[PDB]
């Protein structure tokens, strides 16, 4: 079925599925919680209206190593850095791309193509006996693949 | 990718009678064969009961086979 | 043994009876790669012998035809 | 007939079985010490550095493992490193270094 | 593709044995000269087989192997050289420059007075 | 120095490496302690009629190398263990027919050796002569490689007791001699080393030695002496014939596996085709409340394989928790690149285990053994036995077997999620009966944990345990709302506890599980 | 074995080894504590996605002169300034470099090649009878040696 | 001395006199007396001597960490007997410090001193968990104190030290 997933992917967390943020690509899935501080922006350029700009998104997500830190924090951050990091030397020069992931929000609002342009977080949070992190707050900055039209945007929500 | 034979007539060969059998015994192998001294064989079939009575020991190396 | 010019077949020979008299291939038979390895080292040694002949030529003023020597 | 082995002889002809092939290449890397190979004496395992240190000086152990991994990586960029593990044994006389390129989990018993 | 194997380090880039000979002549002159721009270091026990091993450790290049071979005057690496012998190495770029001059315009060599 | 490399370790300290030989094997891993499997197989080495906790570290070592598939029908178990151990460990049991014999070497009073061979299980006795003897027990016929022993004197004990060192080694055909042990022991009953290690011969053999066992005359041990014997090889060992295995050996293996007090969550066929053995394993699975991975003979076409299930006789409500498979194909050998046929049981168990333990708190058994999330095999060079023949889905599902096909990506996929339940009730699915098995097992564990406790708090404790178990279940999602709210509403669980006498707390519990849509259908419609 | 080390290098501090930050090169080692305020960032450039940028790191570390200030504070800061300071006039013009050091984090996340591009701290902390510092908080700015690929990054963690 | 006093609180005697962390000499113009003769490692270790060689960097290195103990017991190592010597010396120092004191507080004082000594030891890392948890678990120390008469406090103390892998071996294996 789907490839490997990280974060609070299973229902065993016993948390509302709606409040879960999900990113998915051909080989990786990351699931998290909709944390405060999220924002988005769309705008245009003019001087006479010239044109528009693609959508922008600023998503801070908090991750908790409730039971299995290896799959919930370490694997999650590894997948995230793999996705943001442009893989342009994977011995396949005929098609190498920095890769884009698809975003699901509230299980009803889907962005088919979005680019993870920036990532950051802090590693100073407390750890476990092995040393995997218990908590983190990773902020993400995301861009649309194009300047989407009104017919493209308004008809994409649920 | 098939090999076979042609049964001719007249002065070029003769046709076997209908119902007569044509047995084809093909000597086959795996190509180049490496046989190093220092191994023991396992005779079978009529020599399966002879395997414990007769030991076959590789003493003279056998190599220099051919391939395709 | 000698500085007389050898032949590639002679070198291949000397190599092959050396190999067969050596017991390590007896314990390890089936090295048909040493065949063309022997070939290649045979041309290597042939070139080396040509170089040695050049060394003899340059080691004597009569044999050396170079302005420098 | 007699088969062959991989220790400085052959695992496979080229990289068909990818991960075991890389493990083999690393194996002939690690089975050689300094001063035992032409051209690049530094090539190979660097046991002559990390021989017989006190097993409990975690700082020196982490320093030596980091330096060895970085130099072997810059030596063979084709094979990056996924997992290195250092696990003590029943007695103080046994350590194990377990290197896995995500699946291989090949381990060697070292002594300090 | 366009590919040719070569390397611009070999002192034996000069095909003349005699020219290579005086090259090793003056490099020996300088090496067993006591010039301060030379290295100051003794022999290592394992250098018997591998004199260029020191060249690798202090420079990372084996081009100095013939340099140390002529410095020690070794008949073969099977035999050893005494540990503690005074060994001197000049800066590599200096040799590179002299050989560059000698294989472009190594004509006057000794002394140029006036054009 | 660092330049020297040794082969065996004595007093000198050095770093050794593998010799230059023709063949070598490896096995490394750590135990699971999560979910286990059991099954009977015939392999190389290992004690006959013996259980062996096999992991990734011992799979290739104590089980020997894989045998030739054309060398009898013993290749199914080796393929199954090869495919299963790469991901999961087990408790595999091995037995051989009586034809196999193990060798033994006797040292008389003077220490002279005598070689002998005895059938496995036979006990050797020492008469007036035959001062003592040592027999090999690992099961190897000492033919590939061979076992050699070198014995000589050594330093005495702190009590001054004379001591001798003996070293055991295995020598291959090419001449590589790898030691296994080197120990200093003494005839003295109270022989204590300076470490305090006991040097008594039988205790040392049973404790530190692992391949050889010694019998010593307790009346001639005092008068016994020692000799210098080097590289003594065992002769007369024989593995016997393994193609034909007695039903008596089959049932002995069955009963010892039954009596084995080791945890295993599932049982695997390992390619056995004995009908009596299959039935015995089925009843073991039934009365131990576990899952079974039986298989039918691949060599038969569909038309007769469909009745083969009741021909075997494992159809019924008793064999409801087990599943039976079929592999009408032939793949490529991993070593001999030949047409090899073996079942899907081990990989199916592996897929189930990994799927259930994807979840970390308790695990989810509600997973279907269909689809490419688990049912991806693609061994090598698959060849259909009967390309023209195709399975019949309705007759197959009626027969409760499991059928296979190929996915889009070319993987081999098991397109079934049903057990061997004759009746069409909800037990005929696969995950759901496993769900009841798991919940029942957990309930048994908790009841035993709370068992043997004074009354008055037992009811409260059991209620709290069941409530928290329900919490974990609803977190896992297995517990879902009832299909029909008319009767029980949306509340999917009920529990009661009553008393009969001083004992007999009768607890009753009913739950609503979920499903994975085994009934498969669909209809798109038009609009014009 | 290893060259000289500074900071809380020995186990005598009795502190968890996991929480220790370590930097190591051919001739110097510095060991410290993972202090709050750490952060990292990776990003890319676009206008049409053009390319990426190397990893960045902002690591504040606190050092305590518990027993031996000379080795724990003075020697530590000396090694740090030696490493950051480009040694390009060490009478070896055939190879002079500003030098790069290798970073170990949590004893399991290793950055083989990273450049200490910036350093700062305060010297106003109280001292000892001799005068060596008791405490400091040195913040560091670090850069990756290249724009590392996803295959380079994701497979480098433990 | 320099190795043990690298640590500042109490020092670490668990250091091995082998490897180039300490065994680097390289005086000048080394000449082997018997170049053809080579040492025998097993006979050497049996004889409890110490043998030498040359490292990769040309330094002179002592490739041994054993004392002159005939028996192969754990005393035959080098650092471990020094570990007992150091702990015994410290114990003697503290006992003499607390010596000649009225009773009733002596037991408490000795217990506190030994406990803080154990704390410094576990900080130093010399005190490590037992090899076999079957008998003593992972708790590596034990102490008791008893009385005989007006004098003769009998104190008994057992500890689990560490090791630096004097037994030296290794085996890498293949996969094909």
From TrEMBL, chains A, G:
Source organism, top-level taxon: Viruses
Protein name: PmgG
TrEMBL record, chain D:
Domain of life per record: Viruses
Protein name: Pep44b
Automatic annotation (TrEMBL), chain E:
Domain of life: Viruses
Protein name: Gp26
TrEMBL record, chain H:
Domain of life: Viruses
Name this polypeptide is given: Gp22
Protein species of origin: Escherichia phage P1 (Bacteriophage P1)
Gene: 22
